[model samples]
Target chain A: VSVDVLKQLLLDIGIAEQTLTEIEPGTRLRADLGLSSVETTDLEIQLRERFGVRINLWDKADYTMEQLAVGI
Target chain B: VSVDVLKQLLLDIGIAEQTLTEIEPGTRLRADLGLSSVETTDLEIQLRERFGVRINLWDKADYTMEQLAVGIREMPRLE
Candidate 1:
């Protein structure tokens, strides 16, 4: 997933307008967007459903936005 | 993952006042309460840090609240 693609996806899913500018490789999903546990689950479910990507909710560890943007 | 425990966890972590009552086995994390991606990620990390449970952020296939509550409940007691 490219940064642009990830950013677009986040924007499309209502990830909070204020967070758009901070959508970078290192932007912490929670610190940058204020995503709640339920919200993160929903995003994973929705994004996976929408784009058919595989992501683990509980496996978040040192994930960069760049990695998530292209894939994984 | 009892409904009661799940409900309490959501409440403890600021899942929105209106959403506390809707926490249940069938409650869709996004559709029912409007949880954004960022919030969900944060919750996952925080909850794990607090309770040390293992959950995949992408798997939401008919997971019952009862199952999640028993192991995934947290109220932020860390210092």
Candidate 2:
């Protein structure tokens, strides 16, 4: 799961389409994408279902797409 | 996990404090407590943390406190 693929999954979660390319490895989810607490839970569930793993969205809910991809 | 105990847990979860003594086995969570989707998810997590069971809140999101307490009683208890 590279940042390239992760970026696409984030899009499927209904983020602003304009932020796709600009979302670098270091871009913060909450700060940059402006995901709400509930949105984070939804994103967590989406990633887990897609990746087939138990992703802990609450522990590091603010993790960048790069950080998350590395763990997966 | 009796309804007696479940009642207090719901209170701890910040339900409408007034509804404490009134919740029953048939009382639907969403209809009775007015829990939203996100609120249901939060309750699911909270129940898992306390009961140590993997409850499918999505499958039965509107289950009553009595049903949940019964499940907790039947499931393998965690230390």
Candidate 3:
């Protein structure tokens, strides 16, 4: 799963594109982008579905976008 | 914003009703009920839409169903 692909999925789920432009390898969904719980969950579900993995977003909230896609 | 109402909202978002039976003031969405990231967000969005408040769920992941309702119930409204 590429960061660009993950970013696109996030946008499909309603995350603001401007906010995504600021994303980096270290940008956390909560701390950096201010992703609301709902947005985070949407990202999680989309990621899991797209990557075919079990991601506990609650536990992984601190992971950066790169860290998130590293395994997939 | 009663706990019951919150539970219902969780159900509406696809949480099994059986999972809600054990919910209490101390039950956590993630730790206790195993709410996925998607479910948690769905709950957050529904709560905000229903109660008209901004909820930072990432910061409040530890909040229980009852505590969540308190925040929703106590949110100030513009008249």
Candidate 4:
């Protein structure tokens, strides 16, 4: 899956539109975007439910959008 | 797939075979069929594996049988 799809998933989880203009491979899920632990789980669930793949966000304290895209 | 097909899938997932007759578009998943919390996840897994479509079945409060089938229809299929 493309990272753009991942970005849309993040938006689906309620991240603001303005906050995602800089979304890229280097974007940090928690630190850069301020996703909470539950939000991290939300992203994971969204991936699994939509892509039939699971990208465990807990693997790293903070993970990049590229990292998640790779898992997908 | 037809709602009848959806009913068959639910039956395969352990719904009482006798309960099949009661299933309809308006049937409330929990209130009517009494599917346990775990069974709902089972439905999600089956739908994904068999239909190649991922769905957020758990995100909702409760879904009627038809509501779920409609959601699955709207999602189409994914690789």
User: Each model's DockQ?
Assistant: 0.07, 0.06, 0.08, 0.06
* lDDT preference between candidates 1 and 3, better one: 3
My TM-score estimates for the predictions, one after another, are: 0.41, 0.49, 0.50, 0.48
lDDT of 4 by residue, B12-71 (tens): 989788877867788887788877645666776577557754554456656777866776
Per-residue lDDT of B7-79 in model 3, one digit per residue for the tens? 8778887999998897777788888998876566666666655776555445454668888778777887764
| Winner on TM-score (1 vs 2) | 2
Candidate scoring better on DockQ of 3 and 4: 3
For A2-59, candidate 4 gives per-residue lDDT tens digits of 5555565665577775788877898988889899878788877866775577666777
Q: Model 2, range A1-72, lDDT digits (tens) per residue?
A: 556555555655666557765778888888788887777777778656644557777786578877777766
DockQ of predicted model 4 = 0.06
True contacts kept of 1: 0.00
- List model 1 lDDT by residue over A1-72, tens digit each: 456555545544557556667567777667666677876777687777755667875676534676556545
- CAPRI band for model 2: incorrect
Candidate 4 error regions (>4 Å): A1-36, A39-72, B72-75
lDDT of 3: 0.70
**lDDT, residue B51, candidate 3:** 76
lDDT, model 3, position A18? 80
